[PDB]
Design a protein around this ligand. Structure first.
Ligand SMILES: [Cl-]
Ligand SMILES: [Cl-]
Ligand SMILES: [Mg+2]
Ligand SMILES: [Mg+2]
Ligand SMILES: [Mg+2]
Ligand SMILES: [Mg+2]
Ligand SMILES: [Mg+2]
Ligand SMILES: [Mg+2]
Lengths: 303, 113, 303, 109
């Protein structure tokens, strides 16, 4: 009964950073059980963590913005968070409003700002915002409050109002959960897993606009499923009949079978891979459902 | 002063020596905790020493901090310097939300001849 | 079985500007047959114009960037366009690379830039790019070449390389197709239509981050279908049985029928509406497919 | 140096006239010169344009003449209306981004 969208990964949207999927790989040297909060969905359509339906919510947030100038810091924004559709954010059984960044580092954000300065009214201001892992900024998106700032010699004379912060760049990226509640624990989607012996997480990879003073290397970020798959399951609400789905990743024009894998019901894909180094795969294939299989189903190894 | 806290923009020390950083602040922040922070991004930096908002000297590993709440200066000392101590540091005043912070770049070199 | 994704409009992605869908309305005073080039899809899955499958491609473009400093202009960027998945762009049966903006005004774009200055390496640079309707910049995205610039007192010492330009803000927005080929004509998706007498286009509306020195009014932009519907049809490749699908828009918590409409197989929705001014609809409903109907099927009118 | 320069601001009186000198460098001698109106900059409305010669051109209340010895093309606006105030541009036509200089026009009664 379960089917998947007939869309090549390279044409899909990334579920943790708003950009195209560029890579498909396994890498045993990376954390094998990441606790990502976006891009998390059960095959029966249940959204986990802070996963939104719309890809445009990924790594963004909406807020009632209040501004004030502080010497030595600049224009400071206090963001009282709302859900990105305008509805109120109520702290509950997840870490933050839907789509809130689930990684760490220093994030440049862009928001609509209105000024009272003559000859000026509307413009887009870039703010800096520390995400995590730990901070002295007391970020608490779980309680609906985060702080950002932009350097400025004097007040930008900003009008308080509603905003949607969209991500401009990352600085000092770390793929670990951010400060959701001033260091306190929050409700989290569990780490991705478990896996059988010899199984590894399939990673859909994009790259993040980056600030880096010394190194030009691109900043990779992975997710368990492209956003199209997230929305696909959330909408279809399939009936789950076992523990996992046997998928075949195949080239649609040649029929060449590239590899088989297991889409566990908890929303992650495993491949059987014994090597130690990374193994990248072509991104122009199509995932197709074979059948339901039990957790213990042993895959054919890759590479 | 106008900015909440200021200090030396850049300081240079040498292996096995020491250096001292004076973090000057405005009188309004007298009763706030002062601290010395390491690394970037700025507001995820590692706190190396922090006061209890008093004038008591605190020492942790090779770093000391003492708040002069009369002259409104908390002084930081890094002893027995190592090459790995070089990097970006921060004079800091703890408060709810965004802390006042001043960037101090620390260079470390070997003793020449 | 032809059906639609069970997603409320307010949770959907806009198909012409990368942002949430905020509004659902009809407005007889607006251009009745818009020639939008993104968010255009046939019910049988055929993409039209420059419509991409991924919403992250919308109003973006990829390119090989060549930079130079021009006294009196600033840093000048010559973008040799590519498709956003990295594949070569070949001028063909559409106006531009997939996702390219299909509106006019002056667009701020953000690209990853590498510099040769010491103490700086990677940062994100905002460029200004005129889209249209007519320009003296000879923009030719159809031929694969567009020009952007940013004020600068001296060279930014940027390294030539590949970029993906994402939209920061719009200045002097006009919902009319941009300069696709230095003023010449290009292959376009046809205008939206036709409609029966009394029928008007159903509009999914979002708002664009804007620069405006005098007016704080939000800048609206409409599309024929949310992006989730575009990808839904491209994936399913349904068999079309007649000229349109009869849809009902209901609140599924109360079952209230908000209106019926026709989804023409050419990818646009019509409501029967007689009023002269706009009529907005709640965005927390669900579109449900009822049946295939012929072109002449007469809808019941709304307010 | 800058391909084209003019006055940052020029003033005129309603029903009067004003003149603007757009100075440019020798290389742009044989290029078309124009006077443009409005913003966004590079979708501005061209009011008059030369044919790359020294022949005076006039369209409605605006005239332009390119002096190719001194490398200055001069623009005149006559019968100044209050609606004429705003942003204009000295312009040189070339492939791609035109050299342009921003001139703000102010008009008092
Ligand atoms: Cl990107
Ligand atoms: Cl937005
Ligand atoms: Mg804290
Ligand atoms: Mg880096
Ligand atoms: Mg703090
Ligand atoms: Mg030109
Ligand atoms: Mg042209
Ligand atoms: Mg406006």
């Amino acid at each position: 009964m379960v089917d998947l969208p007939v869309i090549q990964p390279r044409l899909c949207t990334h579920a943790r950073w708003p950009a195209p999927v560029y890579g498909l790989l396994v890498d045993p040297s990376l954390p094998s059980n990441p606790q990502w909060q976006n891009g998390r969905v059960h095959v029966d359509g249940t959204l986990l963590g802070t996963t939104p339906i719309s890809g445009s919510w990924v790594s963004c947030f909406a807020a009632e913005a209040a501004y004030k100038f502080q010497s030595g810091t600049g224009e400071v924004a206090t963001f009282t968070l709302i859900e990105q559709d305008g509805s109120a954010y109520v702290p509950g059984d997840r870490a933050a409003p839907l789509g809130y960044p689930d990684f760490s580092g220093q994030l440049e954000i862009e928001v609509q700002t209105e000024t009272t300065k003559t000859g000026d009214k509307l413009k887009v201001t870039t703010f800096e915002m520390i995400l995590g892992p730990t901070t002295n900024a007391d970020q608490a998106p779980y309680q609906g409050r985060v702080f950002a700032s932009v350097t400025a010699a004097a007040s930008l004379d900003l009008v308080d109002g509603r905003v949607r912060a969209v991500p401009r760049s990352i600085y000092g990226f770390q793929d670990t959960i951010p400060e959701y509640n001033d260091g306190l624990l929050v409700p989290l989607a569990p780490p991705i897993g478990p896996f059988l012996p010899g199984e590894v997480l399939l990673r859909f990879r994009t790259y993040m606009r980056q600030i880096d003073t010394a190194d030009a290397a691109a900043e990779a970020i992975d997710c368990a499923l492209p956003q199209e798959f997230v929305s696909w399951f959330a909408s279809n609400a399939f009936t789950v009949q076992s523990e996992a789905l046997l998928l075949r990743y195949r080239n649609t024009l040649t029929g060449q079978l590239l590899f088989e894998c297991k889409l566990y019901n908890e929303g992650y894909i495993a491949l059987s891979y014994s090597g130690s180094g990374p193994l990248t795969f072509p991104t122009d294939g199509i995932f197709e459902v074979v059948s339901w299989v039990p957790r213990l189903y042993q895959l054919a190894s890759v590479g | 002063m106008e900015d909440p806290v200021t200090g030396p923009e850049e300081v240079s020390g040498q292996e096995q020596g020491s250096l001292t950083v004076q973090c000057r602040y405005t009188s309004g922040w007298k009763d706030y905790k002062k601290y010395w922070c390491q690394g970037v991004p700025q507001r995820s930096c590692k706190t190396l020493v922090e006061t209890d908002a008093s004038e008591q000297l605190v020492k942790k590993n090779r770093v000391s901090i003492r708040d002069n709440q009369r002259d409104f200066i908390f002084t930081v000392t890094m002893e027995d310097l190592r090459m790995s101590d070089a990097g970006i540091y921060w004079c800091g005043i703890t408060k709810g939300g965004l802390d006042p912070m001043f960037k101090v770049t620390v260079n470390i070199g070997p003793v020449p001849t």
